Write a protein that binds this ligand. Structure first.
Ligand SMILES: Nc1ncnc2c1ncn2[C@@H]1O[C@H](COP(=O)(O)OP(=O)(O)O)[C@@H](O)[C@H]1O
Ligand SMILES: Nc1ncnc2c1ncn2[C@@H]1O[C@H](COP(=O)(O)OP(=O)(O)O)[C@@H](O)[C@H]1O
Ligand SMILES: CCN(CC)C(=O)c1c(NC(=O)c2cccs2)sc2c1CCCC2
Ligand SMILES: CCN(CC)C(=O)c1c(NC(=O)c2cccs2)sc2c1CCCC2
Ligand SMILES: [Mg+2]
Ligand SMILES: [Mg+2]
Lengths: 331, 331
């Protein structure tokens, strides 16, 4: 029983909250690894709720800090031939996409590789090539972007098909924890200099999905997968194989219709309560990610939260959800 | 007085259409200012419908060609201190947004100033500074982005309000075919190096509008306005004060609920048939743009069309609509 890693990241105030002089109800203490939320009362007398997690990232945490602390170790595990999954979980508006993908610094200040606002996906793709540049491990990188909306499956990277084209899912006869998704494009990323244009094609498909499907960016779940096939050659000419897969999952907004979100919650509850039956098959998302929930994949959850008093109830909901998830045991 | 000038722009075939060896049902003859549509069957015998416009631009037409032939003369009129409007009209998918805004060339190949895929808005803003930072002109540039969705008004540039906040409109007691939009932000663009980040904020707010409102990019109407206040002192020391405004309007898609689109059509019909009553007040769009529709503003329409046989009926509908509009007299 190796526990799932669960971390918390609080977003900073936006311009509007700044000009309204907003006070944070969230204090994160990184060294105590604690998040403390003011739940009522006043200045000189108050109620709070405090939570301990594996790591906590306050409103001022930069993208590089998150990448170095959480992702760098996981990418090392992937390169060793393990499968790893990182979920982002929290209410719409708290920074799941910011964390997982990032944004461009304004006014074309930086190239993509150096942009301090880059998130997990671009940083990860850049660093694989760097880590494996001349260590004797030959490798290939392939990426896919499978998304779930109203329990239908979409491919956000395939250049032939329109986004509206549903994919079909089947059990894998060879892997009984596994599925096969008919139609899903795997794009080979040949070098660092192919990364950005591949991601641009996905961003373009994201805009069309939003035009076509109501609140697509909030209600959809996205699974960005990167698979690294590796071959080492020993001094005696024998070849050594490993395959590492990283799933980077940007969940639908948690705020309180979404069968996959509901089933994820039920799967987590089943696993933490150690009920024998765990309802993976009750949604697409949980069938796809079966191995990341009490399976042989190394899993982390980045729980995203708001500093704003406006968001107190959903913030507490997120923390309680993430804090319960700590008790999931993966092998 | 000045009839509205109407130009046609046919988009080129895309990747998929080229893959499927599509043959164009449109032939554009710019010297003759004509577009010819194959309306029945064959490439060896065929019925055709033809239309003559103020200008016609075929599939080969690039953004720079549109800029030099259409935008330059209009911007020169704006800089002389006059008001001008350019509408884009046509079915979703035919290049309204491409024409008015443009896109980025992939893989960070260009800066925004030099990107060949830049449309009217960025080219205009760049050129205002280029032209006037030259001569003996003291000038200020303000922009606003007012958008209409389901007869509600949104400000898509305001960096410190969320898009969801609707604006109110009222008649302007001083200006007769004029309105006041309470809360609409005019952003000062101090120099060329402030242009892109202002547009990026708009891009960002566009994304949130699409999440919040169904089919936003297709059903919304957007009015991007640029106002230039100029104090020109001539070589001879004379000081001329002028005010120029340019409205760049990206209309909701015309394809077969949208009160402003319906009212625009009915307004054009009344103007062409010279019905004494012209129904401006029946929608927000036509009240906001009343001076551009049989008023004192110099107005042009760019009708966008498809070369694909799939789109024949909508293409014909667009051409007929646009061709009617030629008869509208402005002052
Ligand atoms: N760590 C952060 N630093 C700066 N801005 C952030 C951060 N996290 C989120 N944001 C901002 O908050 C808003 C919501 O972030 P987003 O990634 O869209 O949230 P979600 O995907 O959870 O809805 C965006 O405007 C984004 O720029
Ligand atoms: N003149 C053009 N040249 C190249 N591509 C174009 C042109 N016009 C439209 N397109 C392409 O067609 C698709 C739809 O264009 P878009 O601007 O979104 O149309 P609309 O705004 O009318 O829906 C886009 O992929 C765009 O790049
Ligand atoms: C900023 C526009 N971009 C970034 C290309 C994105 O859309 C994007 C990503 N962003 C990035 O790659 C970066 C942001 C800042 C520097 S790189 S990751 C990703 C997308 C869209 C779909 C696939 C996952
Ligand atoms: C490419 C992302 N961008 C371009 C910033 C756009 O959104 C954009 C425009 N595009 C541009 O400014 C360019 C395209 C290519 C070179 S510059 S004009 C405009 C927008 C969004 C809202 C206001 C009107
Ligand atoms: Mg998001
Ligand atoms: Mg458009």
């Amino acid at each position: 029983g190796k526990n799932i890693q669960v971390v918390v990241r609080c977003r900073p105030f936006n311009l509007a909250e700044r000009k309204a002089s907003a006070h944070s109800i969230v204090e994160c203490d990184p060294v105590r690894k604690e998040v403390s939320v003011r739940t009522g009362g006043l200045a000189d007398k108050s109620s709070r709720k405090t939570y301990t997690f594996d790591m906590v990232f306050g409103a001022s945490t930069k993208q590089i800090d998150v990448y170095r602390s959480v992702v760098c170790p996981i990418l090392d595990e992937v390169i060793m031939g393990y499968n790893c999954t990182i979920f982002a979980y929290g209410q719409t508006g708290t920074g799941k996409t910011f964390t997982m993908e990032g944004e461009r610094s304004p006014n074309e200040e930086y190239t993509w590789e150096e942009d301090p606002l880059a998130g997990i996906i671009p940083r990860t793709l850049h660093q694989i090539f760097e880590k494996l540049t001349d260590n004797g491990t030959e490798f290939s990188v392939k990426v896919s972007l499978l998304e779930i909306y109203n329990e239908e499956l979409f491919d956000l990277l395939n250049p032939s098909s329109d986004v509206s084209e549903r994919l079909q899912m089947f059990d894998d006869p060879r892997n009984k924890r596994g599925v096969i998704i008919k139609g899903l494009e795997e794009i080979t990323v040949h070098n660092k200099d192919e990364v950005y244009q591949i991601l641009e094609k996905g961003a373009a498909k994201r805009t069309t999905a939003a035009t076509l499907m109501n609140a697509y960016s909030s209600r959809s779940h996205s699974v960005f997968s990167v698979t690294i096939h590796m071959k080492e050659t020993t001094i005696d000419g024998e070849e050594l194989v490993k395959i590492g897969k990283l799933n980077l999952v940007d969940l639908a907004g948690s705020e309180n219709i979404n069968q996959s979100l509901l089933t994820l919650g039920r799967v987590i509850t089943a696993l933490v309560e150690r009920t024998p039956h765990v309802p993976y098959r009750e949604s697409k998302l949980t069938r796809i990610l079966q191995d990341s929930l009490g399976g042989r994949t190394r899993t982390s959850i980045i729980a995203t939260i708001s500093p704003a008093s406006l968001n107190l109830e959903e913030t507490l909901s997120t923390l309680e959800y993430a804090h319960r998830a700590k008790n999931i045991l993966n092998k």
